[PDB]
Curated annotation (Swiss-Prot), chains A, B, C, D:
Annotated source species: Homo sapiens
Ranges where the record places region Important for AKT1 activation and IL8 production: 303-317
Keyword terms of this UniProt record: Antimicrobial, Apoptosis, Asthma, Cytoplasm, Disulfide bond, Endoplasmic reticulum, Glycoprotein, Inflammatory response, Lectin, Schizophrenia, Secreted, Signal
UniProt lineage: Eukaryota, Metazoa, Chordata, Craniata, Vertebrata
UniProt name for this protein: Chitinase-3-like protein 1
Post-translational events: Glycosylated.
Subunit structure: Monomer.
InterPro entries: Chitinase_II/V-like_cat, Chitinase_insertion_sf, Glyco_hydro18_cat, Glycoside_hydrolase_SF, Glycosyl_Hydrlase_18
Record's subcellular location: Secreted, Extracellular space; Cytoplasm; Cytoplasm, Perinuclear region; Endoplasmic reticulum
Pfam families registered for this protein in UniProt: Glyco_hydro_18
GO cellular component terms listed in the entry, alphabetical order: cytoplasm; endoplasmic reticulum; extracellular exosome; extracellular matrix; extracellular region; extracellular space; perinuclear region of cytoplasm; specific granule lumen
Amino acid sequence: YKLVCYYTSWSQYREGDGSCFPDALDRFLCTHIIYSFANISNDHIDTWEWNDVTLYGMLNTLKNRNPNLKTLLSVGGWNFGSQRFSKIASNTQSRRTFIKSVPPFLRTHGFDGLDLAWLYPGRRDKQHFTTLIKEMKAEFIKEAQPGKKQLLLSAALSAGKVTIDSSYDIAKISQHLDFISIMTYDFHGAWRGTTGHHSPLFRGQEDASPDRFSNTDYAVGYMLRLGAPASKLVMGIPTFGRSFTLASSETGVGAPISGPGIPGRFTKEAGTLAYYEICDFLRGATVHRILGQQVPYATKGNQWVGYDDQESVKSKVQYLKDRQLAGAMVWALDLDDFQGSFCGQDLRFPLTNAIKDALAA
Amino acid sequence: YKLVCYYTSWSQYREGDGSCFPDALDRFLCTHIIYSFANISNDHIDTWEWNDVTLYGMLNTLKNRNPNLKTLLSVGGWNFGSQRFSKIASNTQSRRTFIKSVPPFLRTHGFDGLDLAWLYPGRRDKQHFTTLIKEMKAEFIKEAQPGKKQLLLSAALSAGKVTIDSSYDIAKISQHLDFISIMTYDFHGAWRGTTGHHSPLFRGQEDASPDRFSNTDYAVGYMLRLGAPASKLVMGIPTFGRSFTLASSETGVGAPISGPGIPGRFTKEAGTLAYYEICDFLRGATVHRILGQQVPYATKGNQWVGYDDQESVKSKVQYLKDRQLAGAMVWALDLDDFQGSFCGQDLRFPLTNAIKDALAA
Amino acid sequence: YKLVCYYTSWSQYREGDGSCFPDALDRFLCTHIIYSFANISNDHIDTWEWNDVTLYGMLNTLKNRNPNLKTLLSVGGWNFGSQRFSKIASNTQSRRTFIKSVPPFLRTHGFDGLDLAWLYPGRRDKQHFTTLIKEMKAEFIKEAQPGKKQLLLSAALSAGKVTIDSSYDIAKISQHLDFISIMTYDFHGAWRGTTGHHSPLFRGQEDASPDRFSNTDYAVGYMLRLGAPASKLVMGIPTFGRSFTLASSETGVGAPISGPGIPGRFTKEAGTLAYYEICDFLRGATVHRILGQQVPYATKGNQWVGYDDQESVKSKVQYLKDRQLAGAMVWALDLDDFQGSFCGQDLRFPLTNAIKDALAA
Amino acid sequence: YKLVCYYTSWSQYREGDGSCFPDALDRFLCTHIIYSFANISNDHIDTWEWNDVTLYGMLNTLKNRNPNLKTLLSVGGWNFGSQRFSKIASNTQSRRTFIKSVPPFLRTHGFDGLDLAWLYPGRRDKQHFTTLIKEMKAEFIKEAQPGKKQLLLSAALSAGKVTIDSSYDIAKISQHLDFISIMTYDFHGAWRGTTGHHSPLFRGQEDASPDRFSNTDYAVGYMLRLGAPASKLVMGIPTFGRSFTLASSETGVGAPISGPGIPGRFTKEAGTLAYYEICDFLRGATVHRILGQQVPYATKGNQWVGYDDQESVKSKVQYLKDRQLAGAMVWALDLDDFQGSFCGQDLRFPLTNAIKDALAA
Ligand SMILES: CC(=O)N[C@@H]1[C@@H](O)[C@@H](O)[C@@H](CO)O[C@H]1O
Ligand SMILES: CC(=O)N[C@@H]1[C@@H](O)[C@@H](O)[C@@H](CO)O[C@H]1O
Ligand SMILES: CC(=O)N[C@@H]1[C@@H](O)[C@@H](O)[C@@H](CO)O[C@H]1O
Ligand SMILES: CC(=O)N[C@@H]1[C@@H](O)[C@@H](O)[C@@H](CO)O[C@H]1O
């Protein structure tokens, strides 16, 4: 089983014990680690943060004691701009420059691979996206055709039905990619203005979600049906939760909300909490397991958070093993308890370790 | 929380330890016990079996130590002839004689109420059935008018979407009935000529069943939607399994079958097994929990049976409690381990006791 | 001990069995293989031959089956032109561009380091050469400072006293280089217009040479005295001979000549023969061991050639081991009998294997 | 070519097999044999050993079967005293008497000529030596005027540059001498307190000897340069070796010593060893060929000896033939294996037959 794990370069800047650099990662935890993100600039792949070269260094250092570890560089992400990635993929010169720039940059900086994270190609870009992928694989085959270890090509794809239907030719791109990470989290499948979990496994209670699409099971089945081979599909599992401010005494699934949850001290983003933040929040909170969805939420005063814990990630790994998927993708290493000193069990990366042990069973 | 339990009269004729009579029944187990079934003969309510009047008393003796206990007599059943019942409830005199005949016969034989089990009112009968339930509740209010204790009225309704849509005016009859026993088992939800569980709680893997309706969650939600109040709805939990003969080595959900399953020694009905026969079957067998349905099946040799156990009935009780339903209905006392000698715990009614325990916590 | 061996890119064009491509090289033969030469173009390190990129890869493939093997790329050579290397190294901006370009180029194309072959810095360029080496070494230390395998830096240096005195600050460049390959061959030690061996180990007969300086032993000792550590000094051993056309019946050392030797069938360069050509020539030749110089010459008709054989390279290896040098350097693989079919042993790389054997003993 | 061999008269007194007398000598081995040493007493040439006259007889017996063998007697030696030969040679009366005394004594005792072994003239005796040689030769020309066979005049000379510069007018004495024997052994060219070979053919490793001039090639080249005809120069070759006692684990050339080598059983002279003694030593010893010097040393335990073997003496002959020298000189028959029972092969005079063979090839 593959265990693909994202590290985000902006986690370095978080205050205090929140600050995360690649020298804090367990080198035997993951089969693959992906660094996010890289810019594209003058149509060439390029660094993002001032100190990426150092941080690339720290990441690849982990391969010294662990030969099997693979590292990829993810290009794109949320702050990149769907627009900008569009302009580049659609134009024929721009695309060639970009593609031609990739292998030298990866080799120069110690990476085994590229992860395309265009979030997201629009309706207009479906063919461009297929082309980009096909030609990038072609370039990687050429570059290594004299005897080398060939560079890996992956992509992070939406788990949302709408985006999958409009943006991705699944059968075509699946043939050229080495794996697909499906982002089975951040589903927006609650009734407007109410609580719901952002990463249910199963739909659960039929009449308590507006549709059947907003869950891990549906999206995994859909992508399999659309022609992605089970053996190339990696199933995304979050180490963050999505939080809401409650607007009444109701704390169930479907309760009214007034908006996103109060920011965490360290991640400082409304509507999100790192698992290490949730471990703090849980002291004095009530935990409930949403029966049909197989995932927990916690509530304390006017705050509600839907997240994953050791029991839930085990259920998720059972699912992915039963479907013979290739493995699990973890977003993100820097949002697990990587200091091992918030979750009260002195265990670094409790969630990721949980996934790893369930893959072994 | 009501806990409505069905005792069947034909269960007296099973060999050896199979034989069951109202004497073997724990008086504290249930709140309501429902005797099934009664005839309608020449438009008056009648007995069925030769020794019904004895068994009535054996049953109504149990109320001696227990004044909280209620009993009800169910009239109808599968053998009745759905034809015959429709005739009776369409004709204006028939219905009048019938309704008039019930209250004396009930007080006489010691019953606290009637349970309607017309299986099933078809197309045409929707209004007849609505009226029958309306005028029967008219009679039971008139009968107890001199300060008696009003007779209870209830009905066993289908959990099948088709049958509910064609047969029941749930908004109307729910105002007249005291509770509704919704038969959330014997779904026909599997792909054709393949294995499936007959009483799943949730739909489960979205791509592994033809429809979203053949599960307990759907049925309960549907009825809540159609007008039935939560405080009048009692959720059916089976103490029996449905079995199949497999046709290949595949033993999963949706494995090819060739027909129903070898009959039990004591129940002697192909495709059925009492819980106590299942305990016999389990020794030697692989149990697997269906992940999204939250129910087990067992397979051994060319036999596959989907059944409910202590873990699974507690989940269903957690489900019914979370929806604030009236309580749980059990089909049937004579099919749980009533000896206490099969399931190796030396415990009478393991499944029914699991349901009681969970209801109180 | 190191065994550094040069492969020359232009050897690929030699007719017939002379043609040598990197895939003919024994992957277990040498510790370090150096590819010569790379261009510098627009102050950037660059390819020379149109197929360099294919040949780099056939070389680097040799590492798959033997990971210990190291590869370096040599920049410069005799066709480069000393005066064009001057301007690059002496302009501060050219030199930075160049130095900046090397590590990406090396990593992109699979090489473990750079070999400098400036042939040769004049008196004017001594300091420039020193500076070039210091800065170039600093860059490799920087590029690697986060946990990479650091890039090797080596230099092919002249064994000629006059060039060493004019061009090299030995003490300073020795601390920065990882090894020095001293080109202890092609000495111009013969009395003008007379036969002499181009790679004597010692001076031999005192009154039969012009100078005491044109011999391996002098050049080694001189570099040691000047500050090159033994542990960084690699001693060049030729797999080629230098040939003369005799002008009389005299056939000894110091016999009159009329010009360089007739070209070989395959190397096609007057005054030079590959070892495999020498094997052909030895058929009907007389060989003599030069008494003080520990090396052979052969003569046949009007031709005379001073070369190395298995015995003579063995002696050279004894010598370098007794001086505790870092190992042997071989110019060049493509001039050894790489085919194995010329020296009537059916044994590929006869000279280099002999060198290898003597280093291991 | 000439082959000039010394027998030493004091070799009779050595124990057992060590004992050597002229009857032990093959008569076909040498072209000249030189009996050493004779005395000068009361300014007349005398005998030295009590039995000299017998030994001279046995020696001269050898010419009975061999018409071509030539014998000479050698006045002087180390034990004569430089101080005393000076006084005989510097006084016009002394010297005239000596000269005149010489021919009759030589005719009387069977000798074909005289060999001068003044070891050695000082600065102050240079011109006296020139005058002795000139006058002695004038005498021998005059004594032969009655149609006799002219007596042979030869001289043994130092190979050391200092002695040559102080003592010898090579150009002048060369015309009067029939041959010069150059003593190209017993060189004092080890760094002080260290091992060195006493008879190297060439200088060898440039920085592993104090001086350029303690070797055979330099001595020969120097004499030629000072005006000795090649056709009169006989190059000395030793059959003994010189031995040290090591002071350390180091056994190489220039290793630390503590004093001379353990005396041999038969020679009893610290720091010397006959070849027959060396043949025993070799059993259990390591032999190394010194690359520069074309000569072996042997070490075993705390002992180290530099000697000449069959290989080394063949090379010394090659050198003398290439330089067109008159022939070889051997010191000495009694230090070679004259028994023929020490060196394994059952051959008498291994080293001297080696010389002879090489002179004939
Ligand atoms: C610096 C960076 O990460 N992003 C730049 C962005 O700032 C913008 O200027 C663009 C050109 O319009 O190039 C991008 O890569
Ligand atoms: C099973 C049973 O009790 N059936 C009776 C029987 O008398 C039957 O013949 C019918 C007459 O039409 O009436 C039913 O109530
Ligand atoms: C062999 C080679 O590639 N060398 C080029 C040469 O082609 C030429 O253009 C020169 C211009 O001054 O630059 C060199 O590097
Ligand atoms: C007898 C002999 O062999 N040697 C003597 C020596 O002993 C010494 O007496 C000298 C004159 O003082 O004359 C030498 O020839």
